Design a binder for this molecule. Structure first.
Ligand SMILES: *CC(=N)NCCC[C@H](NC(=O)c1ccccc1)C(N)=O
Ligand SMILES: *CC(=N)NCCC[C@H](NC(=O)c1ccccc1)C(N)=O
Ligand SMILES: [Ca+2]
Ligand SMILES: [Ca+2]
Ligand SMILES: [Ca+2]
Ligand SMILES: [Ca+2]
Ligand SMILES: [Ca+2]
Ligand SMILES: [Ca+2]
Ligand SMILES: [Ca+2]
Ligand SMILES: [Ca+2]
Ligand SMILES: [Ca+2]
Ligand SMILES: [Ca+2]
Lengths: 626, 626
């Protein structure tokens, strides 16, 4: 909005940016009734008229000027016996537009969510396209490779002005000081105009028609103290008077939203599998499973591992997504065990981003291991859509001196990525304490296109009771293993303290069942119970009695399930048969992997020993309304 | 939600909290068809029935139990040739309700804004009811006075259980560790159960009917890292098994929203005026003005002042408001000049809260003085209501090496009080740089019930030109003052560099005019221009040429306006006459106060030398939808 005051005493000179509302004040300095308005054909006035202040006169230009004051407005004041008196306005029209991909196609004042929303997207430049640097590309103030610009967002300044216009006007590009530490802007022809050191920059623009390209990268993910928006503004300054200060004539802005970090559920098609190298036959089995599922396979060796076999736990592979660019990004967990370097050294790289949260020298729990970080498949809940699913992570039921939690910095980060609205589940009853110890998700061809699997002592008691009823009470759990105390179905069933333990575990699992039902919108027909016994040991914390079968590797329809070594009835482990009877009808393929004397005995299973990069959702996160 | 699994093998025992959904799993452990359901009259089952898993059985109790298992459910399984087989469920119904003033009358799972919203309110306990302490009451972990509880929010736990119930159950009260540093909870009969040191506490509750009262205070205002919600939860634990861990049976919560700090515009009725004590006749004039406006008057003496006369600038008196309690609260500015102690020592006190932001040892601007902090009267803008008005504060147009801004910590705080959605205006062209240097708001009996006053060189040129046209060109500005270079209207008008300066100032004021028009919804008919000349001096920054009349004390309809000492035409200063002609038709009373050789010459005026506590809005902030 602009109000030009017109004065018969002296002509006025004004600039008019096209797309702006220019109005006239004709009354303030009127002489002494009536006025008339004559203007050159480039000017459209909307409004032989009386000198009433309340009546509005608006001026709109159709085209940029070819020279200063090349459009004219003449206001004629007159009365009953007064010769008409003229006020002169000389206008200069210019085109100043700051453009970005506000419609999110790859090419209002605010950023809005959803399919009818508006607002451009910025990716954090947290990958490493640069040769032999150890840093994410956005840690310096330079575009070091041409490929790096593909991660960046394009913004253009179009101007159309007279050839001499910037003799007396200057354009400045700026960002609030508030936001300068989270963005960097390069000018193309390729060097920094805005960023952490500099919140504004004077542009060198020639008169006429000109187009100037900028590349923009984010430096920070949305977080507790950063909602995720960055506004960049162009200001047009009048520098006509050599004594007087600059005078802002016009401001325009674009508002960017920083891309959130997004996880991928087990129901997204797998692309690449990870584990550690002893476990040679364990590695054989996942190697064939990866082959069957068409996945690239990467392995971390003893040298790099530093003895760390829990490839599930230091990292989580998500992705960031903008209309121009989608890339995988590793969330590196602060647990900083022997795998501490793996995400940094050879998961971070060309088109593979990095991020980490939490204290890095100590201040951590078991529940900060990313076996305690999962996501549901897409779900709709009492009408609210979660088309990227909901992050799931384990916690206690209430905070006590003895309870554990994932570090608040991690929880806060996950929440500030609004788009998979986290749900806290109860996992602290488990010795290790990870949600993957009692749940998994698998694809299914019907209902909602998945099933929630839950560990279930109920199902295993039922299974073993049926076996006994059919005469197999002497059947031995742990047939196979040369150095473990074997146990008969009869004695398993008659052990009253084992049954009490498993009643307590069942309760803990039931509590979460119902939590997932409420928060994820599940009916029982969404859920499969997997026969699974547990035992309490050390602080009354639960570990698995036999290899924890729910803690499986999901590679499409190909499943890597820990071999339980259950009672062999008619030539087969009945646990394996029960699992197969439950999952094969969904068209899933179950391979049972011996993880016993390498994973199981150190309190984890196949899922705990592996990790998977999966295909990002096709649904665009910005088309959600969180 | 709860799913009880029933088993003919063995009876089950369950607790049922009234108001909860209890469902039965009848199929899982059914024998081998059909089942029937018989229950005692206290139990209503909703559901001679087939053994289909998908058919749901729900159980609801109407009354609390008098003893354990005093309600019964019996499930009869049968078939074609099978005698009916019974499963037994023994239920114990209890009443566990956590209550607060969720309807906001003084007495869903989420806090919601607006007149049909829900959610209780918590005040920050940032006043000082305690005798001779220097601290806000919420800095310790004790209720030291009975009056202190009036600032606190009541929350009640009602329970109705069997007399022996808490033999095998325990209740715990908790808050996330995330939120414990921002709340404190006392138990009444009076000591702390929850707070910064403790996130949970085991309640001692007797069986039967019991009611336990808690008092809750907030410790933090909503801010960048605190959206302003605090959830407190009660968990019911089963402690029946002496070996096994506690087992959560039921959780319920109340969600509190912390009251935001709120400012009061000049259109709110005044209650108390502040200034500093030399200025004896300045003090006389405000003393009479306060008297006319029925205001208490408090004065800060030379000893305490430390030479600081700018009582506008260290502090801003707002208020916090809950259904049970409203109190004034002083926002103490970090400028920490000679008035540094005044807000702490004798504005903070009984039913007068305190808050401060920003760095306190150095790191400040002129624009952190609270002459640069104002609010508009209530306004509606293109349909959006701002029923408490919009905070207004001064800034530059873009950040440069030479621009100033209010400290980000202050801006962030003001924004996080969502309820007066701040607007940044342009004040950095002014030497001192405060929005009060160029705007004020006054009550008016018509349109929107106020006018925006703006300083206007345009109006003063017009005024002086008319004077000259009427023959008064020799009239002297500064008639009155014995030691200042007087100046004739003729020479004022003919000074071309003065006119250039005032053209630039006009532009800066016009820019804000239009900003206020957009952001506040104003039409010109909302706005009065006040004749005012400026001059540029020192960095081309604007100061007032004569005492800045817009910088006035608004006490209802009684105005304390700086005496301009303008040209005396027909026995009166024509500036004073012009102002009176503009404001008297609105029914305002103008007193012109000589502030010349005490305020004006040190770059400020009457508003700058004073401060006002005003009446809080009657509209309840929580009934807004920000
Ligand atoms: C399943 C999952 N995500 N698991 C990680 C759990 C195993 C791991 N084990 C050990 O640290 C360990 C050290 C020494 C002896 C035995 C086990 C863990 N607790 O993180
Ligand atoms: C109008 C308003 N809110 N004013 C405060 C402006 C005056 C004050 N003056 C001085 O500090 C000063 C010191 C020494 C000599 C003259 C003036 C200020 N700049 O804060
Ligand atoms: Ca770079
Ligand atoms: Ca890059
Ligand atoms: Ca790490
Ligand atoms: Ca890249
Ligand atoms: Ca994981
Ligand atoms: Ca206290
Ligand atoms: Ca108090
Ligand atoms: Ca202070
Ligand atoms: Ca009080
Ligand atoms: Ca103020």
């Amino acid at each position: 909005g602009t109000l030009i005051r017109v004065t018969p005493e002296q002509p006025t000179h004004a600039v008019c940016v096209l797309g702006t509302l220019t109005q006239l004040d004709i009354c303030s300095s009127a002489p002494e009734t009536s006025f008339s308005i004559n203007a050159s054909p480039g000017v459209v006035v909307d409004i032989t008229w009386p000198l009433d202040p309340g009546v509005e006169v608006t001026l709109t230009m159709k085209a940029a000027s070819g020279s200063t004051g090349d459009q004219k407005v003449q206001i004629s004041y007159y009365g009953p016996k007064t010769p008409p008196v003229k006020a002169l306005l000389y206008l200069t029209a210019v085109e100043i537009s700051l453009c970005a991909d506000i419609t999110r196609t790859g090419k209002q004042r605010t950023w809005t969510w959803g399919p009818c929303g508006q607002g451009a997207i910025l990716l954090v430049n947290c990958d490493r396209d640069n040769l032999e640097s150890s840093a994410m590309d956005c840690e310096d103030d330079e575009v070091l490779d041409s490929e790096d610009l593909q991660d960046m967002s394009l913004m253009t300044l179009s101007t159309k002005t007279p050839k001499d216009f910037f003799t007396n006007h200057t354009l400045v590009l700026h960002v609030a000081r508030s936001e300068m530490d989270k963005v960097r802007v390069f000018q193309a022809t390729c060097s920094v105009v805005l960023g952490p050191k500099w919140p504004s920059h004077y542009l060198m623009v020639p008169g006429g028609k000109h187009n100037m390209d900028f590349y923009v990268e984010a430096l920070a993910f949305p977080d507790t103290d950063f909602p995720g928006l960055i506004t960049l503004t162009i200001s047009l300054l009048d520098t006509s008077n050599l004594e007087l200060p600059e005078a802002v004539v016009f401001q325009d802005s674009v508002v960017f939203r920083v891309a959130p970090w997004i996880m991928t559920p087990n129901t997204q098609p797998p692309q690449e599998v990870y584990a550690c190298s002893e476990n040679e036959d364990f590695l054989k089995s996942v190697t064939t499973l990866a082959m069957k599922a068409k996945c690239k396979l990467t392995i971390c060796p003893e040298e790099e591992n530093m003895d760390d076999q829990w490839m599930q736990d230091e990292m989580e592979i998500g992705y960031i997504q903008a209309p121009h660019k989608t890339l995988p990004v590793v969330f590196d967990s602060p647990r900083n065990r022997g795998l501490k370097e793996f995400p940094i050294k050879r998961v971070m790289g060309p088109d593979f981003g990095y991020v980490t949260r939490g204290p890095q020298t100590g201040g951590i729990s078991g529940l900060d291991s990313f076996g305690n970080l999962e996501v549901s498949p897409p779900v709709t809940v009492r009408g609210k859509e979660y088309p990227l699913g909901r992050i799931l992570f384990g916690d206690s039921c209430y905070p006590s001196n003895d309870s554990r939690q994932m570090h608040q910095a991690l929880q806060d980060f996950l929440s500030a990525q609004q788009v998979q609205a986290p749900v806290k589940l109860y996992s602290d009853w488990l010795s290790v304490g990870h949600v993957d110890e009692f749940l998994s998700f698998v694809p299914a061809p019907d209902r909602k296109g998945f099933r929630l699997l839950l560990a279930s002592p109920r199902s295993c008691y039922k299974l073993f009771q049926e076996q006994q009823n059919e005469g197999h009470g002497e059947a031995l759990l742990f047939e196979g293993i040369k150095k473990k105390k074997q146990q008969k179905i009869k004695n398993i069933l008659s052990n009253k303290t084992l049954r009490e333990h498993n009643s307590f575990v069942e309760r803990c699992i039931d509590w979460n069942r119902e939590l997932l039902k409420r928060e994820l919108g599940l009916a029982e027909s969404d859920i499969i119970d997997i026969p699974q016994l547990f035992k309490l040991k050390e602080f009354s914390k639960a570990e698995a009695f036999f290899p924890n079968m729910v803690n499986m590797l999901v590679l499409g329809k190909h499943l890597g399930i820990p071999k339980p070594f259950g009672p062999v009835i008619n030539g087969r482990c009945c646990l394996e048969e029960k699992v197969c009877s439950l999952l094969e009808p969904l068209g899933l393929q179950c391979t049972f992997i011996n993880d016993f004397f390498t994973y199981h005995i150190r309190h984890g299973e196949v899922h705990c020993g592996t990790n998977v990069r999966r295909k990002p959702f096709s649904f665009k996160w910005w088309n959600m309304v969180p």
